[PDB]
RNA sequence: GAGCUAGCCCUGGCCAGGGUGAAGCUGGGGUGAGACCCAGUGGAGGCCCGAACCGGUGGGGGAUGCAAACCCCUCGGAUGA
RNA sequence: GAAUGCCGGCAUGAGUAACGAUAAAGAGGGUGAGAAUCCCUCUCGCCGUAAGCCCAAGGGUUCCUACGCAAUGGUCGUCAGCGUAGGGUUAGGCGGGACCUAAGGUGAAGCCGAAAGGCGUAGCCGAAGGGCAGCCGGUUAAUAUUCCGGCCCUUCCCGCAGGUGCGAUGGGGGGACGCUCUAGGCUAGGGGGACCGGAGCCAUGGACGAGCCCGGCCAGAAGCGCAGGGUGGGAGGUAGGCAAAUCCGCCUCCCAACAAGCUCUGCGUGGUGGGGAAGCCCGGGUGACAACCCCCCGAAGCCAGGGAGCCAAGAAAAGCCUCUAAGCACAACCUGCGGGAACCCGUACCGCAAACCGACACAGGUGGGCGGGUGCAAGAGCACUCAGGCGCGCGGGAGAACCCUCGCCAAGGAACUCUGCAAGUUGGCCCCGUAACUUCGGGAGAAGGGGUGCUCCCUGGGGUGAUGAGCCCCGGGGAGCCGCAGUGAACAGGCUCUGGCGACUGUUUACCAAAAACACAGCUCUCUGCGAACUCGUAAGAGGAGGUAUAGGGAGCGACGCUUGCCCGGUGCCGGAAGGUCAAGGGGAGGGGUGCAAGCCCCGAACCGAAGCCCCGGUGAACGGCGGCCGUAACUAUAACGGUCCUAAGGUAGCGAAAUUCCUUGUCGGGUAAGUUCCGACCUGCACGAAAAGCGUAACGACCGGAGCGCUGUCUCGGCGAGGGACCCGGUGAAAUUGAACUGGCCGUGAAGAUGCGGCCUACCCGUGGCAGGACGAAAAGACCCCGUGGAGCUUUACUGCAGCC
RNA sequence: CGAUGUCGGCUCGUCGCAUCCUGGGGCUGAAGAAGGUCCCAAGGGUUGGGCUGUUCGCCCAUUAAAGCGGCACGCGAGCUG
RNA sequence: UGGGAGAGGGUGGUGGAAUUCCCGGAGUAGCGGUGAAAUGCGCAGAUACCGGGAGGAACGCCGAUGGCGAAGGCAGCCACCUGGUCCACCCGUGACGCUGAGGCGCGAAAGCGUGGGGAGCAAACCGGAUUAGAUACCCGGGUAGUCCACGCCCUAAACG
RNA sequence: CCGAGGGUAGGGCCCGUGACUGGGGCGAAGUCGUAACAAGGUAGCUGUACCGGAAGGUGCGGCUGGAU
RNA sequence: AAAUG
RNA sequence: GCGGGGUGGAGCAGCCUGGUAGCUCGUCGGGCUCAUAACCCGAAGGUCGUCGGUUCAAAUCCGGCCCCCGCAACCA
């Protein structure tokens, strides 16, 4: 439920925050955290790879359990939720009866005090972990992995989820949060649920500094600029494209697709994305 | 205004400096072809 | 060649004083319960005035200069991108 | 003899400009061959959140002493950061290393690349971050947490005693963290004292006083006291912390809970050891047996790893503690005490500057800490001033024009001008009061006004303390006094109305543009299913992201409000197992060369045969496009209406002489005495128009228009005054430029603008202060233009390639 | 073209006369007054403001009058911009 | 006190018919549509038929001249939460009543905001017809919207 | 001290007037269509929404004050 | 399909 | 200066490729209707802006002139 501010900033106006109502520990597990090392969107060749990055707030990064598979039959309770800087949904802490301490992504409805388990024999019930095949059809679902045993690579992001649709051989059929129709390994891991933090999407940035905190440094249009650096660049006075709309490349950037033709996965993919 | 030598043993010494030298083909070359030259300094004296 | 300059990374440092008085909280009123209203408390903000600091708006000077961009008056920001 | 030639030398401009902040000087006495300039004293002025003091960087002997003045020093020089010589930098505790990690760098394993080389986990290197044991005073010409004195402390080695399952690169705990706000108690620092110590002082009308002037501390082990930080004790179970574990994690039980206890800091006290003024007498000595006390103010510093709130969610590793593993338990480790041992480098001096960066002893630039007092509401602001430091390395005169910086001005008051440019005005605080409009925050310091000093009387609350005295902080009321004037000096908004553009705070052309440009939250299209797309790289490898469609890339638009129409013929992009074309390859009808011949060799039709293109569709917040001619209504005009041609479709709403309107100063209205600008309208829009967005919009703006009030030297129209120059004298002494020069006016002439030719006229020789009309004055081999089969950046459906992708 | 800086303003003038005014005239469809028109005359004079960068022009209020031209469309080693 | 009938309201869950789309099979020269046509769809394999799947919206028969609510309005089925109302007994309180300017709440559809959803339908819009014209009626398409959550709007032939 | 009033500054209500603009009323006869009254030749009216030279059209829901 | 006086 | 154009009453074909003027609308006559519109039947109307040339022959091809649209008028 996100909080809105009164005017009495210009800035003020239209910023909104997260309610942070469902967090109740507002530190990490120091055996949990370990340093993110900041890029500015250089690589090892110490190249700007990816424009406009940089200057963010500081961050620790929380070790997150991806695989769940590790500990099979072995249940934990859920001691605390916490915020996550490093990604949209937040985090819950698990106390395994094991003595164990793990961070998992924490799903929609999932309370402080209740227990989740991961494995075959798992109830169908909100955060517990189940090979994609006994899930039942229908389940909403989230943390998916894409190959067995690889870690959960799809719906992980404040309200995502994706839903089982149907079976085929030892394939299930999952609808991505894309609106793609996937075919995935039955015997992928994924947590019954949806991603919590669903109000994610409706918060208001309201001011630039918002985004220069969030390590996202000013983009500037390709209209902006002059031939050497973009396709869209000079023209005396404003101008509109003359030209398809391009990248800084020069490649098309309205509608040109850009997936590999002969991608192996192409056979496990049933529908492309939908809207 | 600030002007563009500002001095600093520690940057001099880790730029232009012997052992940068040696550590590149094109140093390695500066270096001989300044002892070709007959340089009396090799490279930059910096105190340390 | 990035000891100038541009961006980023790591680790430190700095921002006199004064003003405005958001949320929340407490109390009071209110109602079936509410919303909500009042007062007190509170101390938010690319908020306000103004040094340091960072600037460089207008004018005057300077013009084989004090200076290959400086001086004076004035003016912008000054908890933040 | 010429090349704006090259190198050198020497001229001219010229005894000219200048001598580097307008903080400022004067005199006496010394020294010496010589003194405005060196030394000393007195007087004067300047800085004092510095122009004083302390660190770091950089510099590298510049430090101190003696002896010098050729050059260096913008003059001088006896002086100096200059010349010669001698001296000077002392550490287990300060800084760095023999400790740790950060980005980054390097790199056993491993990966990649024609070579060179590029990567890469661990490891290693890497600090102004973590960790770690010294405080106060004395001493030298020059060093001092370094030497000395006092009082403290650390590590290593050996030993003695006591204690314990001892033992690590392994496990674990801790180290360990943000921003804003902030409590309690302290300290640093400061103010006062009628109390304490002190050489003295009584002036000039008064005071011998509860007078003036000066000072009234610093460090300190144990212990103690005050204030804080940190921390639960026990037992049982145990499958997790990549072996083990009694440790840690998890579960249960019992006790304990603002505590206490234990532990660790800060502050106070504390054996002890130090310091100690003015004044006076030559750095010293005396003062002095110096005194060393009380009250108040009080940090941003300390207790600290304190507390609260918030979202953008805030290093690592070692030291250290705990756990066990091989091992070992004659050992080994812990604790206490003792003896011994304790290496390397830096240490001078400048350090907002004459010693650093700017070619200079250069009005510029340079990070951290201290930065006293009073008054002004506060403060690091402002004036003065302490400690301390300076008067800026040419001076002396004069008192012109003109210039700069500054002060004042009769009457008028923007009449100045592109423009109120510039300069006035206003100005802090307290009180009264405050409009359209609005997104209800604001607009707002709106506007506009009143108050402001000093004296006396009365009195309310707060801090310290004791509930009081004193001190300190907020106020309240009454009566008075003086001046032209009470934020009496200094620092400190002129205001309103109304358009354009941009929502806003931000950002930019370092050094002619700060804007309406860029950015911005926000909106939409599009790509991306993860070994993502995209980007960098030959690759490996990286970024994306230790992210996963509420995410990441690309593009346009640009808060918000109300909206965003019609065209898919062309180009683009998306979809389309048909068909047409289509390269290599397959196929091999049928031909050819050669050989006596088996053969060897070549050409080769149909037919099969990708993507691409053709073809069929879709698609606009994809590139883009959104008509012409003729007529028509109460006999005006105009045209709701009609005709016809063309297109893929013919511009919708809204707006409009506009940042767009050519004709144009359109026309009408407003404002003015007068309005090419401005504002409001109209609509024949040369040539608005809907995300290269359309129309609005409160608030915001060193943006660009228009107007008014206030006030002014902007002006009528100029006058006077100040200082720094200009001027004269002494010292030092440049520059561009320069074919040579014995270098006048007119009217002609001349390559068409003549000091230089002709004719006339005028004119004794040489300077100084001034002014700029000429010397087609100087500067820069015109930057406009053309020329060159000269160059370079940029574009595309120019040509031809290449990467990349299919 | 190995550089002759370019509109307007300001400042400072100076010259020409095809004379705006003032002075002297002739003709007049000159009664007077006031004009018209031509002749002579360059001595002096020839205003302040609104608009626009403007020159020019229009306009306001006056005037004896509100002249027109040249001087590198006079004048940037004089200023403005 | 004990009973009763009902699409009264709210939440969650769930069932089948049909339309559309997609994949597979089988199959060929038309389908669709109208007053008649054309646009449109279809040999790139449509329509008609069979199997499978995805998804949204509305609930046939019962059903009525019926029922419920103050009105707007409420219809598959299930469960939970909840309002109104009638009846019998004649037990309890003893006028505690009626109305109601203001106020407060509710209030079809369309509409609006922020999300989601989107099968059918369908303003706007496009195309085919008709017509003198046809910015209509009819036909082929088709975006909001219709649906859900939350918040607004507060209208009506909100009528008996 | 109060004080008629004068003055400065900022507000509120009312009236008159204003380039232009909005629809309204009235004046017999023009131009365009034919929306309504009959099933008015698509039953009408309706609140709302979008659209169009004009009346009007269409969508959603409502009413009968609808014919047969 | 079929407008008007 | 460059490009296009002028043809019954209106708007358009024919021109390129010489011989043949065509389409919609309007106008006139007649129907239908009570009447008008619509609708049906039949008709008339252009010597092709103009003058000159080439040709057997010119709307057509080549020139001159007039007239109407459109583009251009830049460095200065
Ligand atoms: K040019
Ligand atoms: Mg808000
Ligand atoms: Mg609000
Ligand atoms: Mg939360
Ligand atoms: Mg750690
Ligand atoms: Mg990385
Ligand atoms: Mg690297
Ligand atoms: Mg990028
Ligand atoms: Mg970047
Ligand atoms: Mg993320
Ligand atoms: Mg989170
Ligand atoms: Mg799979
Ligand atoms: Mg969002
Ligand atoms: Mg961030
Ligand atoms: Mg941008
Ligand atoms: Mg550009
Ligand atoms: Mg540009
Ligand atoms: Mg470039
Ligand atoms: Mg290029
Ligand atoms: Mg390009
Ligand atoms: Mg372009
Ligand atoms: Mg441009
Ligand atoms: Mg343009
Ligand atoms: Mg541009
Ligand atoms: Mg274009
Ligand atoms: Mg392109
Ligand atoms: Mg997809
Ligand atoms: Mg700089
Ligand atoms: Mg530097
Ligand atoms: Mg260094
Ligand atoms: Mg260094
Ligand atoms: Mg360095
Ligand atoms: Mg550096
Ligand atoms: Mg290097
Ligand atoms: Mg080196
Ligand atoms: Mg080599
Ligand atoms: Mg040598
Ligand atoms: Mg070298
Ligand atoms: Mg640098
Ligand atoms: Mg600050
Ligand atoms: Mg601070
Ligand atoms: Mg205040
Ligand atoms: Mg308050
Ligand atoms: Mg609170
Ligand atoms: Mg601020
Ligand atoms: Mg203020
Ligand atoms: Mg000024
Ligand atoms: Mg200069
Ligand atoms: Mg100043
Ligand atoms: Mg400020
Ligand atoms: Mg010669
Ligand atoms: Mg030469
Ligand atoms: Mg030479
Ligand atoms: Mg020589
Ligand atoms: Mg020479
Ligand atoms: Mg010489
Ligand atoms: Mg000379
Ligand atoms: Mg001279
Ligand atoms: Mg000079
Ligand atoms: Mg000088
Ligand atoms: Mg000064
Ligand atoms: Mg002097
Ligand atoms: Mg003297
Ligand atoms: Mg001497
Ligand atoms: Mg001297
Ligand atoms: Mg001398
Ligand atoms: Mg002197
Ligand atoms: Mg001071
Ligand atoms: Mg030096
Ligand atoms: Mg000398
Ligand atoms: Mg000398
Ligand atoms: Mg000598
Ligand atoms: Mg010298
Ligand atoms: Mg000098
Ligand atoms: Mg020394
Ligand atoms: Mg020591
Ligand atoms: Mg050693
Ligand atoms: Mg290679
Ligand atoms: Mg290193
Ligand atoms: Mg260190
Ligand atoms: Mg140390
Ligand atoms: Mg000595
Ligand atoms: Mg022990
Ligand atoms: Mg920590
Ligand atoms: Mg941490
Ligand atoms: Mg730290
Ligand atoms: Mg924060
Ligand atoms: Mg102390
Ligand atoms: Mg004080
Ligand atoms: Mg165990
Ligand atoms: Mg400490
Ligand atoms: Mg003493
Ligand atoms: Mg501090
Ligand atoms: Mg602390
Ligand atoms: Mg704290
Ligand atoms: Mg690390
Ligand atoms: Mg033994
Ligand atoms: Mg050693
Ligand atoms: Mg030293
Ligand atoms: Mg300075
Ligand atoms: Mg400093
Ligand atoms: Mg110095
Ligand atoms: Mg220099
Ligand atoms: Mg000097
Ligand atoms: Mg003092
Ligand atoms: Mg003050
Ligand atoms: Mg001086
Ligand atoms: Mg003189
Ligand atoms: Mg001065
Ligand atoms: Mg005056
Ligand atoms: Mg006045
Ligand atoms: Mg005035
Ligand atoms: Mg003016
Ligand atoms: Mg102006
Ligand atoms: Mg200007
Ligand atoms: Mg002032
Ligand atoms: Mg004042
Ligand atoms: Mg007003
Ligand atoms: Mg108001
Ligand atoms: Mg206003
Ligand atoms: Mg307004
Ligand atoms: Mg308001
Ligand atoms: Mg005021
Ligand atoms: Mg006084
Ligand atoms: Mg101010
Ligand atoms: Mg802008
Ligand atoms: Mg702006
Ligand atoms: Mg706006
Ligand atoms: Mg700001
Ligand atoms: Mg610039
Ligand atoms: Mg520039
Ligand atoms: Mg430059
Ligand atoms: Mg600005
Ligand atoms: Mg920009
Ligand atoms: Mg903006
Ligand atoms: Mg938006
Ligand atoms: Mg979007
Ligand atoms: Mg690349
Ligand atoms: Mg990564
Ligand atoms: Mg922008
Ligand atoms: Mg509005
Ligand atoms: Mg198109
Ligand atoms: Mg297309
Ligand atoms: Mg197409
Ligand atoms: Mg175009
Ligand atoms: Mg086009
Ligand atoms: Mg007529
Ligand atoms: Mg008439
Ligand atoms: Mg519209
Ligand atoms: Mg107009
Ligand atoms: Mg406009
Ligand atoms: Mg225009
Ligand atoms: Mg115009
Ligand atoms: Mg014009
Ligand atoms: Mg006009
Ligand atoms: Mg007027
Ligand atoms: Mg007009
Ligand atoms: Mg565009
Ligand atoms: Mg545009
Ligand atoms: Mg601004
Ligand atoms: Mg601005
Ligand atoms: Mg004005
Ligand atoms: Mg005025
Ligand atoms: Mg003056
Ligand atoms: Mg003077
Ligand atoms: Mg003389
Ligand atoms: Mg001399
Ligand atoms: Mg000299
Ligand atoms: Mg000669
Ligand atoms: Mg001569
Ligand atoms: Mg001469
Ligand atoms: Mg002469
Ligand atoms: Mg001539
Ligand atoms: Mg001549
Ligand atoms: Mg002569
Ligand atoms: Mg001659
Ligand atoms: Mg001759
Ligand atoms: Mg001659
Ligand atoms: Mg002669
Ligand atoms: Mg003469
Ligand atoms: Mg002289
Ligand atoms: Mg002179
Ligand atoms: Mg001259
Ligand atoms: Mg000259
Ligand atoms: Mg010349
Ligand atoms: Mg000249
Ligand atoms: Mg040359
Ligand atoms: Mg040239
Ligand atoms: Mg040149
Ligand atoms: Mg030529
Ligand atoms: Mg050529
Ligand atoms: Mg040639
Ligand atoms: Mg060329
Ligand atoms: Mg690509
Ligand atoms: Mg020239
Ligand atoms: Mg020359
Ligand atoms: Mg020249
Ligand atoms: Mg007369
Ligand atoms: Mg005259
Ligand atoms: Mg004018
Ligand atoms: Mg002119
Ligand atoms: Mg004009
Ligand atoms: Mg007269
Ligand atoms: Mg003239
Ligand atoms: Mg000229
Ligand atoms: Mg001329
Ligand atoms: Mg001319
Ligand atoms: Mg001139
Ligand atoms: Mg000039
Ligand atoms: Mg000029
Ligand atoms: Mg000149
Ligand atoms: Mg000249
Ligand atoms: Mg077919
Ligand atoms: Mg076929
Ligand atoms: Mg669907
Ligand atoms: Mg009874
Ligand atoms: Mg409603
Ligand atoms: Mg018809
Ligand atoms: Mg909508
Ligand atoms: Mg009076
Ligand atoms: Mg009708
Ligand atoms: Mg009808
Ligand atoms: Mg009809
Ligand atoms: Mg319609
Ligand atoms: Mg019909
Ligand atoms: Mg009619
Ligand atoms: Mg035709
Ligand atoms: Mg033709
Ligand atoms: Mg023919
Ligand atoms: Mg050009």
């Given at each position: 439920?996100?909080?809105?501010?009164?005017?009495?900033?210009?800035?003020?106006?239209?910023?909104?925050?997260?309610?942070?109502?469902?967090?109740?520990?507002?530190?990490?597990?120091?055996s949990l955290?370990?340093?993110?090392?900041?890029?500015?969107?250089?690589?090892?060749?110490?190249?700007?790879?990816?424009?406009?990055?940089?200057?963010?707030?500081?961050?620790?990064?929380?070790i997150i359990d991806f695989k769940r598979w590790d500990k099979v039959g072995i249940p934990a309770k859920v001691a605390?939720?916490?915020?996550?800087?490093?990604?949209?949904?937040?985090?819950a802490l698990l106390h395994y009866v094991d003595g164990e301490k793990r961070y998992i992504?924490?799903?929609?409805?999932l309370?402080?005090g209740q227990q989740v388990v991961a494995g075959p024999d798992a109830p169908?019930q909100?955060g517990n972990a189940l090979p994609?095949?006994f899930?039942?059809?229908?389940?909403?679902?989230?943390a998916?992995?894409?190959?067995?045993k690889?870690?959960?690579?799809?719906?992980?992001?404040?309200?995502?989820?994706?839903?089982?649709?149907?079976?085929?051989?030892?394939?299930?059929?999952?609808?991505?949060?894309?609106?793609?129709?996937?075919?995935?390994?039955?015997?992928?891991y994924?947590t019954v649920?949806?991603?919590?933090?669903?109000?994610?999407?409706?918060?208001?940035?309201?001011?630039?500094?918002?985004?220069?905190?969030?390590?996202?440094?000013?983009?500037?249009?390709?209209?902006?600029?002059?031939?050497?650096?973009?396709?869209?660049?000079?023209?005396?006075?404003?101008?509109?494209?003359?030209?398809?709309?391009?990248?800084?490349?020069?490649?098309?950037?309205?509608?040109?697709?850009?997936?590999?033709?002969?991608?192996?996965?192409?056979?496990?993919?049933?529908?492309?994305?939908?809207? | 205004?600030?002007?563009?030598?500002?001095?600093?043993?520690?940057?001099?010494?880790?730029?232009?400096?012997?052992?940068?030298?040696?550590?590149?083909?094109?140093?390695?070359?500066?270096?001989?072809?300044?002892?070709?030259?007959?340089?009396?300094?090799?490279?930059?004296?910096?105190?340390?």
């Amino acid at each position: 439920a996100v909080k809105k501010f009164k005017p009495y900033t210009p800035s003020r106006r239209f910023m909104t925050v997260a309610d942070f109502s469902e967090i109740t520990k507002t530190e990490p597990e120091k055996s949990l955290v370990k340093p993110l090392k900041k890029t500015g969107g250089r690589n090892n060749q110490g190249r700007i790879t990816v424009r406009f990055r940089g200057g963010g707030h500081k961050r620790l990064y929380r070790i997150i359990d991806f695989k769940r598979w590790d500990k099979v039959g072995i249940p934990a309770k859920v001691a605390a939720i916490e915020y996550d800087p490093n990604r949209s949904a937040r985090i819950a802490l698990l106390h395994y009866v094991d003595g164990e301490k793990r961070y998992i992504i924490a799903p929609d409805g999932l309370q402080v005090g209740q227990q989740v388990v991961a494995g075959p024999d798992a109830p169908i019930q909100v955060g517990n972990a189940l090979p994609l095949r006994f899930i039942p059809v229908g389940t909403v679902v989230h943390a998916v992995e894409l190959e067995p045993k690889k870690g959960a690579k799809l719906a992980r992001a404040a309200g995502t989820s994706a839903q089982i649709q149907g079976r085929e051989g030892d394939y299930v059929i999952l609808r991505l949060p894309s609106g793609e129709l996937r075919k995935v390994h039955g015997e992928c891991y994924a947590t019954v649920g949806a991603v919590g933090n669903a109000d994610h999407k409706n918060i208001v940035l309201g001011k630039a500094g918002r985004s220069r905190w969030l390590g996202r440094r000013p983009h500037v249009r390709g209209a902006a600029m002059n031939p050497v650096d973009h396709p869209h660049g000079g023209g005396e006075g404003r101008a509109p494209r003359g030209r398809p709309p391009a990248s800084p490349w020069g490649w098309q950037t309205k509608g040109l697709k850009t997936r590999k033709r002969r991608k192996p996965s192409s056979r496990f993919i049933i529908a492309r994305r939908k809207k | 205004m600030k002007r563009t030598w500002q001095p600093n043993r520690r940057k001099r010494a880790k730029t232009h400096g012997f052992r940068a030298r040696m550590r590149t083909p094109g140093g390695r070359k500066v270096l001989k072809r300044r002892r070709q030259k007959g340089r009396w300094r090799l490279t930059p004296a910096v105190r340390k």
